[PDB]
């Protein structure tokens, strides 16, 4: 099964309403594993299975790093604002991470955003930064001049990130590697006169990845299908739905290697 490890950083200039100047959160798939902010000034585990396997002395080194990274972010956003001739509150974002796919192959990514829009995207294969505009182009040139940092990121993405991901997957196996099959139902109702609506509703499933489709006489529908988002139920499970307007219909649900058909 596909798994991912991700670290995000969010920087805000001139924050109001208790919003921290800096937040950093780590995830394994949908699950938060670590947190740091400019208020606590401390890196802490956000999952019981992280706290249970990593001694409090492990977070000591990460606290220092994050304080240093918090300072760099503040400086970088001040520089970005100057380049764009921008006043007031602006945000700077970073995402680093890797995926371990089902086939055993891997992906790595490193990107920045200014005001929630793509800014700089790392290319670990050509060892370069893709810039959206001229301000990003200026940053790109300064970063590309540092060959060492680039090779270090490629290594971290391809090697270190994967080794951490595998280690965290072992710690959180009872959560991350479990399967809770969906409970699926089909509801039929007459809506506007003549118009019949069919809804395929699934709930109580984990992992959140599910494929839900509507078919007509065993073949795919060329009519409009409505899709409900995969939503967290609040207990570690998810829910989703798919609807069609009936003019031999069946709902096809795939989840974790189990295919399920519900005919109307």
């Amino acid at each position: 099964r596909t798994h991912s490890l991700r670290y995000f950083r969010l920087g805000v200039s001139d924050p109001i309403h208790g919003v921290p100047e800096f937040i950093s959160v780590g995830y394994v798939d949908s699950h938060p594993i670590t947190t740091y902010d400019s208020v606590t000034r401390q890196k802490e585990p956000r999952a019981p299975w992280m706290a249970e396997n990593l001694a409090p002395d492990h977070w000591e080194r990460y606290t220092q790093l994050l304080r240093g990274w918090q300072q760099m972010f503040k400086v970088e956003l001040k520089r970005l604002q100057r380049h764009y001739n921008h006043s007031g509150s602006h945000t700077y974002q970073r995402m680093i991470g890797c995926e371990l796919l089902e086939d055993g192959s891997t992906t790595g990514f490193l990107q920045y955003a200014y005001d929630g829009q793509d800014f700089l995207i790392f290319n670990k294969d050509t060892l370069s930064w893709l810039a959206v505009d001229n301000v990003a182009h200026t940053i790109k040139q300064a970063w590309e001049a540092n060959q060492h940092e680039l090779l270090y990121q490629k290594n971290w993405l391809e090697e270190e990130c994967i080794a951490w991901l595998k280690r965290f997957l072992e710690y959180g196996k009872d959560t991350l590697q479990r399967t809770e099959p969906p409970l699926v139902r089909v509801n039929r109702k007459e809506t506007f006169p003549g118009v019949t609506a069919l809804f395929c509703k699934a709930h109580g499933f984990y992992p959140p990845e599910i494929y839900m489709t509507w078919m007509k006489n065993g073949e795919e529908i060329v009519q409009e299908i409505d899709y409900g988002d995969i939503l967290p139920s609040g207990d570690g499970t998810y829910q989703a739905w798919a609807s069609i307007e009936l003019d031999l219909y069946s709902c096809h649900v795939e989840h974790s290697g189990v295919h399920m058909v519900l005919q109307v």
Partner: antibody
Amino acid sequence: QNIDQPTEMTATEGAIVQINCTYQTSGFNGLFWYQQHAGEAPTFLSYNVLDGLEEKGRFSSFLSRSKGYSYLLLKELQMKDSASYLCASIDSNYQLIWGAGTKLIIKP
Amino acid sequence: GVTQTPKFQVLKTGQSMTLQCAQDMNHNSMYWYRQDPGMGLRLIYYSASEGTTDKGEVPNGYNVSRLNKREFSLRLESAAPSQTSVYFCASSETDPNTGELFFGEGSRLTVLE
């Protein structure tokens, strides 16, 4: 883990010397070579993180990730090359681990 | 680059000592190491950026102050003979460092009964 390098090495003036360094078995974020003359501060020579040979004048730094080792190759040895060579590596928690250093003696 | 004072010092057991270190390279990260025969440099304390400091491998008997972006002082409040050593201050642009670590000239400290 450990960073291991020979305590001392002796070679002849004009010849070639290879200083080996075996590093930590867990976590790797790069390897450095530093030069240190007797009574002086260490000075940076190189940083390696990916596989290969980086050449910088009479000095070359090699890294093998699979083999877990690095070497500092010194060519056409000079008396001025008499110094200690420090190997240092970055672990999975970005902590720098230092080797004890290899004292290099040049026979004129 | 990195200016470290003093180069030489003799202390009596119990005496206080401050080692000064300054860099004008606009570096964020500063470090204090000690060098002893037969072993690799050992980190006493470090400062990842201005406004933060933390213990290294050998913090006992020392304390530090990251006074501003430029300065990182090392204090021995009550000198002990085991503190006889060569002390190097260093700085790097950021932490983790993949570039050059810049060292001060060294401070040779002798603590005697």
